[PDB]
């Protein structure tokens, strides 16, 4: 095995409780930036700023289990 990949909408739930830098049940544009460093993708606040924008199902400031399910839905 090397990189056969295999992550469905079910493996995303864990990605949320696993990328919670603050670990408070939800995340904020502040921690969402570190989540990208875990995968690389070098970018500035110009790309991350919009990442959380459309990533928030209701744009409230943080992403929960729901807003997170859609976040990865259009974020690969």
Give the annotated binding-site residues for Ca(2+). 20, 22, 24, 26, 31, 56, 58, 60, 62, 67
Footprint on residues 36-55 left by Ca ion (CB under 5 A): none
Residue 66 touches Ca ion, criterion: CB under 5 A: no
Q: Which of 14, 17, 18, 22 binds Ca ion (CB under 5 A)?
A: 22
Return the number of other C-beta atoms located less than 10 Å from residue 24's C-beta. 10
Distance CA 40, CA 73 (A): 19
Q: Return residues touching Ca ion (CB under 5 A).
A: 20, 22, 24, 27, 31, 56, 58, 60, 67
């Amino acid at each position: 095995k090397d990189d056969s990949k295999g992550k469905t909408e079910e493996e995303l739930s864990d990605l949320f409780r696993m990328f919670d830098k603050n670990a408070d049940g939800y995340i904020d544009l502040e921690e969402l930036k570190i989540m990208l460093q875990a995968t690389g993708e070098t970018i500035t606040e110009d790309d991350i700023e919009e990442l959380m924008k459309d990533g928030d199902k209701n744009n409230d400031g943080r992403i929960d289990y729901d807003e997170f399910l859609e976040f990865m839905k259009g974020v690969e």
